[PDB]
């Protein structure tokens, strides 16, 4: 039937209350259903909320549940995916290109009349409110926030008896801020994609004064906190002159800012909660490779009885690509899908390699580019050791700034270039 968008503000219980209602209805109506979580952590949260329900996690069951990226990767790999009657997408504002492609694919099956869909999120695509409702009033305090260690000033930060979640634009920024806070006698927990599964539980089992987080905590994380500090900065990959570069710190989106603030003001009986913020929000993000990458994904997804999925309607404004531009042949597509899935390469970079007819196991492109593609970290080249073992430096045929944007990306690419994956 229909694509229903339910805007439900942070704390409204999308997962804990609304999702079970939706599931019970779909089970009763005998609708063949998929539930799409943005992350593995949300996935487990949903599981807990949905115990007893006949759900298939990725008896008999007509309801499946998996991540956005799993969904669109299955579609890319051409492994059969059910012709679901109902698609429920959680956190449908998520800008990960796999989420953007899933939206477009889902809206297509709806427009073709194969299915109905429900998109859930506080901040629907096309909408722009940085200060959504909350369970309890939030004090919004525009203020000056340090971007680095400080020796003096900023006493509003440290003279605070409650718990604060501070969003940083990078793991690196988090280390320098967190360390300054620890030197000031504060107990800090660091949350990023490396540290999350072990450190996040500690937010419940330990006493803490600050959580220093990257944007990983914008959706997957519930804190019992009194304050969020949010400089509203990110670093984003921008496509320019046939290469991807990290540009920032730049303003975050209204959706992200709403998610960040949405960490507090969630107990109806608790009034003191503060959102201490600085800077603007921005929807000017067409330069972000993310949108190009969505099209690279979607151009390579088959739709039975239909044609190339366009992006979700309010997101079509984000790209100027023509239908089928990024479509690959069968074998290039396999390479492309595995460069992403197993290689852990960013989508745009995987695309460059695959469309150049490079085979998946052939890593020579990681070393034989022009000198202008010499990768640097801490201002120095990165010497690696391939499968045979002698002196090569990282210098890819195609330049994607994400390779060296943090230590997790760099280590993953060194492993890839060495032929480990």
From Swiss-Prot:
UniProt topological domain (Cytoplasmic) ranges: 1-421
Annotated effect of mutating residue 46 to T: Severe decrease in helicase activity
Domain Helicase C-terminal: 152-319
Modified residues (N6-acetyllysine): 194
Annotated residues for binding of ATP: 8-15
Post-translational modification: Acetylated by host KAT5. Acetylation modulates NS3 RNA-binding and unwinding activities and plays an important positive role for viral replication.
Site (Involved in NS3 ATPase and RTPase activities): 260, 263
Function per UniProt: Displays three enzymatic activities: serine protease, NTPase and RNA helicase. NS3 serine protease, in association with NS2B, performs its autocleavage and cleaves the polyprotein at dibasic sites in the cytoplasm: C-prM, NS2A-NS2B, NS2B-NS3, NS3-NS4A, NS4A-2K and NS4B-NS5. NS3 RNA helicase binds RNA and unwinds dsRNA in the 3' to 5' direction.
Subunit text: Forms a heterodimer with NS2B. Interacts with non-structural protein 2A (via N-terminus). Interacts with NS4B. Interacts with unphosphorylated RNA-directed RNA polymerase NS5; this interaction stimulates RNA-directed RNA polymerase NS5 guanylyltransferase activity.
Record protein name field: Serine protease NS3
Organism: Kokobera virus (KOKV)
Species lineage: Viruses, Riboviria, Orthornavirae, Kitrinoviricota, Flasuviricetes
Residues of the full protein shown: 1679 to 2108 of 3410
């Amino acid at each position: 039937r229909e694509l229903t968008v339910l805007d439900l503000h942070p704390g409204a219980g999308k997962t804990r209350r609304v999702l079970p209602q939706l599931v019970r209805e779909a089970v009763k109506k005998r609708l063949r259903t998929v539930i799409l979580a943005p992350t593995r952590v949300v996935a487990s949260e949903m599981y807990e909320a949905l115990r007893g329900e006949p759900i298939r996690y990725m008896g008999n069951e007509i309801v499946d549940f998996m991540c956005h990226s799993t969904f669109t990767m299955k579609l890319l790999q051409g492994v059969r995916v059910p012709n679901y009657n109902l698609y429920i997408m959680d956190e449908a504002h998520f800008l990960d290109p796999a989420s953007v492609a899933a939206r477009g694919y889902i809206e297509t099956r709806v427009s073709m009349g194969d299915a109905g869909a429900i998109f859930m999120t506080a901040t629907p695509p096309g909408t722009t409110e940085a200060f959504p409702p909350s369970n309890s009033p939030i004090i919004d305090e525009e203020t000056r926030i340090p971007d680095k260690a400080w020796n003096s000033g900023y006493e509003w930060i440290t003279e605070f008896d409650g718990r604060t979640v501070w969003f940083v634009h990078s793991i690196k920024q988090g280390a320098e801020i967190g360390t300054c806070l620890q030197k000031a006698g504060k107990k800090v927990l660091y949350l990023n994609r490396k540290t999350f599964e072990s450190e996040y539980p500690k937010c419940k089992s330990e006493k803490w004064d600050f959580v220093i987080t990257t944007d990983i905590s914008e959706m997957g994380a519930n804190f019992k906190a009194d304050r969020v500090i949010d400089p509203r900065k990110t670093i984003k990959p921008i496509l320019l002159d046939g290469r991807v570069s990290m540009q920032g710190p730049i303003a975050i989106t209204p959706a992200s800012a709403a998610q960040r603030r949405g960490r507090i003001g969630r107990n109806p009986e608790k009034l003191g909660d503060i959102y201490a913020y600085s800077g603007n929000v921005s929807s000017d993000n067409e330069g972000h490779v993310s949108w190009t990458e969505a099209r690279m994904l979607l151009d390579n997804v088959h739709v039975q009885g239909g044609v190339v999925a366009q992006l979700y309607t309010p997101e079509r404004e984000k790209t100027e690509a023509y239908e089928g531009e990024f479509k690959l042949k069968t074998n290039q597509r396999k390479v492309f899908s595995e460069l992403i899935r197993t290689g852990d390469l960013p989508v745009w970079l995987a695309f460059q390699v695959a469309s150049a007819n490079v085979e998946y196991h052939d890593r020579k492109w990681c070393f034989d580019g022009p000198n202008e593609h010499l990768l640097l970290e801490n201002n120095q080249e990165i010497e690696v050791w391939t499968r045979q073992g002698q002196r090569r430096v990282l210098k890819p045929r195609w330049l994607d700034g994400r390779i060296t944007s943090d230590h997790l990306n760099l280590k993953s690419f060194k492993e890839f270039a060495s032929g480990k994956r």
